[PDB]
Design a binder for these strands. Structure first.
Lengths: 60, 207, 117
RNA sequence: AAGGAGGUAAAAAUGGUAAAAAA
RNA sequence: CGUUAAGCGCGCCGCCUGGGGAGUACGGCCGCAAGGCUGAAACUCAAAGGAAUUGACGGGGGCCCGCACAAGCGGUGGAGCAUGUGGUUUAAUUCGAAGCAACGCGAAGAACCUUACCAGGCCUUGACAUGCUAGGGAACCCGGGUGAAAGCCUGGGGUGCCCCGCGAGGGGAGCCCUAGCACAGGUGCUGCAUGGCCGUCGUCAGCUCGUGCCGUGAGGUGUUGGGUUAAGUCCCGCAACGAGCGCAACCCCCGCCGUUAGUUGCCAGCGGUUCGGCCGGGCACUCUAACGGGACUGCCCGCGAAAGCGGGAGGAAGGAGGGGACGACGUCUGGUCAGCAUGGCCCUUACGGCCUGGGCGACACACGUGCUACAAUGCCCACUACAAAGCGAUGCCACCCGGCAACGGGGAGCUAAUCGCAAAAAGGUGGGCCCAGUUCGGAUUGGGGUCUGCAACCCGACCCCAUGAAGCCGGAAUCGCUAGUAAUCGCGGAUCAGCCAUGC
């Protein structure tokens, strides 16, 4: 399932330990860099497309 | 293979952020959340006149949007009864002070997003791919540009083999910086598939 | 003042190319329009030259030694090309001849040193 | 040797992949 | 091809007339035979061809480069443990990726969640949005039965607003209920229908434009030739002269200097001191983090026609200074419909949805990446040392205390260059072991403890004390690495209740 899953956590159930992050610009939990509330592919699509402040195509 | 966004590499002094506002560490998320939502529902509505850039500023209620349209004419509406509803909803789903500002760019055949917009939309209306698109690169270098390239990838005419038909005219120095390039990809949707329209346009040195 | 401005190696290569056009287009930097006829030395090499001229309908004067065909040329000169003194006589004469059409008669000077040494 | 060339030398344990078909 | 004509002309002979049928049938002459000479047709296809151009290709070769080899230092295979994997198996052990280009890879935190897999309970105009018909409820605050939980049957409250009211009433809206409907939804198939996005050949040096010339032309040329470089980098040649994307350069980190600037640093320079930057003071020095300059074979000498090479210096900086992002034209129907969108095919009270359980961790083996090791250049306990970077608000958590500890109770400061994570470790400085399945190595093993979390059986990390296997330095083979690189040693962040992180 997918659609119902985002709704599952979107409404906080019983135990604190049943929440799991969600890429609200793609829709998944795997590798969602919680800082941004974005998955990794959603992350890169945002930063790349210039729609993300503070970043930098880092070159350190 | 890749190419990488010239953009996601032009963020030196050649591409200043689309969204300019500082954020708190915690805050960051919800801010960008509402932000991307703004651009989002804006996209569906204020497309009508070519939505290129979407300049964003935020200080503290400072929700300043500098919508680079293409021609704000039949889009602000008579007396601003259309700018009205949009700023309205903007306020409806932004718990702060909204702004509109229809800053269209002087010239059409510049800033590749709207270039590729018309481009893909020609195929969206089934039209001649190579003919009218070669006419598009044409129009670019017929405006005063320095290098235009339009890659169009996908199911042309159906026929299994999704070619990547490509045209160009004028220098496109993608490894350079000062030179400055504008990149824009339109998301072309054939009634029978999704082909990707993409465009680079060159400008010049010194700047 | 493109001196202190712009990188140094940039200057360097520009100096190289400088002497590209300098060395290679030394005399030629005023050769404007169609140059009437040719003149040209040992008719073979300068018949890659005479080739291009022959196409341009630019009458061929040139100077010839034993090996190279004459007929491709319209105004042919037979004689030696080997030694400096050949073209010394012939050219110097020719030069204060075109300047006989002019004026000056300046002392016939060049060669002579390198003519044998 | 710089080359093109005319005569005499060396040089491969293995295999079957079909095909209607796109620009 | 060209005085040995395939050139210009003349004499004569044989011979040609689509490929295939076929030099075959029949017939005639021929031969000991094998066979020959002669020499057709029906039928059948619309092509068979000659050269010459481009490029892929090649179990041809020549040149070129590279940890390819050599040359050295440490390793995988050998044993135990970790994770990934085949296979194996179960009710389910959920899919994806496959020579290099999959195998500590999606997975950057699978107990239930996650979750797509199974057995079972159950809902289904659906956990989600969208609108209509006809009906009722105001929204909405609580509670009882039941049950593993979702779900299920009821009970207390309840009566905000528009119009017309000191009266009665209905209709209308957010607002929930039920039938019906239009519908949602499906991590079901299809990456051989696709976008996008990575791979990869490969930082390999490659792909071409312009006028001119050569070629009937396709096209070649430029780009094939030599020295040289990391380089299609540069020079020389040269029927070409150049020009663009590639390489480089403009971008960042790192090394030298400067100017702004001084709550980091400091007697460096002064006063005092609880002598501990601790109290005033100061910007010198570190630092911080900004704006430039500085290196180009520029100088000097010997060689080469130059491109370059040798030697020396000036300088923090030599001949591309070290690194990083940077990755063409193109191939490969690579990888991905299980991140997303997505053309189509498809189940629609079931392939949809919830819940509780169970698996993703299973075991007769096999395999890649890995941690530890097998020991005295070592193991062990004590004292002192120098790190850099990245963190921390309902989090960082110094402090006393209880506990040998795991951690717990009271408790400071902290939107941080000022507070804490935090002890860097190896180094060094003392004492123990005395060459041994050893104070080695802890693999595994039992009786107990701490912590998170509803919950720690499957299936959590961590503590204790008793257990203490294999392992004597690994055959075929095979990997890494050219400078602060290898080898060794510690440190943080990501996501995360926790943690299987020996991973990155």
């Amino acid at each position: 399932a997918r659609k119902a899953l985002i709704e599952k956590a979107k409404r906080t159930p019983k135990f604190k330990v049943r929440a799991y992050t969600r890429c609200v610009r793609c829709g998944r939990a795997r590798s969602v860099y919680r800082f941004f509330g974005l998955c990794r592919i959603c992350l890169r699509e945002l930063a790349h497309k210039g729609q993300l402040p503070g970043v930098r195509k880092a070159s350190w | 293979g890749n190419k990488i966004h010239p953009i996601g590499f032009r963020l030196g002094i050649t591409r200043d952020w689309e969204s300019r506002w500082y954020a708190g560490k915690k805050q960051y998320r919800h801010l960008l959340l509402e932000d991307q939502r703004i651009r989002g529902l804006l996209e569906k509505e204020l497309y009508s006149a070519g939505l290129a850039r979407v300049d964003i500023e935020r200080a503290a209620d400072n929700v300043a949007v500098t919508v680079h349209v293409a021609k704000p004419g039949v889009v602000i509406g008579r007396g601003g009864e259309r700018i009205r509803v949009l700023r309205e909803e903007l306020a409806k789903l932004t718990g702060k002070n909204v702004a509109l500002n229809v800053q269209e760019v002087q010239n059409p055949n510049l800033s590749a997003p709207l270039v590729a917009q018309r481009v893909a939309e020609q195929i969206e209306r089934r039209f001649a791919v190579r003919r009218a698109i070669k006419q598009a690169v044409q129009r670019v270098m017929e405006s005063g540009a320095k290098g235009a390239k339009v890659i169009v990838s996908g199911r042309i005419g159906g026929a299994e083999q999704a070619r990547t038909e490509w045209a160009a005219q004028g220098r496109v120095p993608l490894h350079t910086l000062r030179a400055n390039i504008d990149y824009g990809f339109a998301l072309a949707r054939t009634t029978y598939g999704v082909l990707g329209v993409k465009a680079y346009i060159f400008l010049g040195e010194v700047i | 003042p493109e001196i202190e401005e712009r990188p140094k190696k940039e200057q360097v290569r520009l100096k190289h190319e400088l002497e590209r056009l300098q060395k290679y287009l030394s005399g030629f930097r005023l050769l404007k329009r169609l140059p009437d006829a040719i003149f040209v030395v040992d008719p073979t090499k300068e018949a890659i030259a005479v080739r291009e001229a022959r196409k341009l309908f630019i009458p061929v004067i040139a100077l010839a030694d034993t090996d190279s065909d004459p007929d491709l040329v319209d105004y042919i000169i037979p004689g030696n090309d080997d030694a400096i003194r050949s073209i010394q006589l012939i050219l110097s004469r020719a030069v204060d001849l075109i300047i006989q059409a002019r004026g000056g008669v300046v002392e016939p000077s060049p060669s002579y040193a390198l003519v044998q040494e």
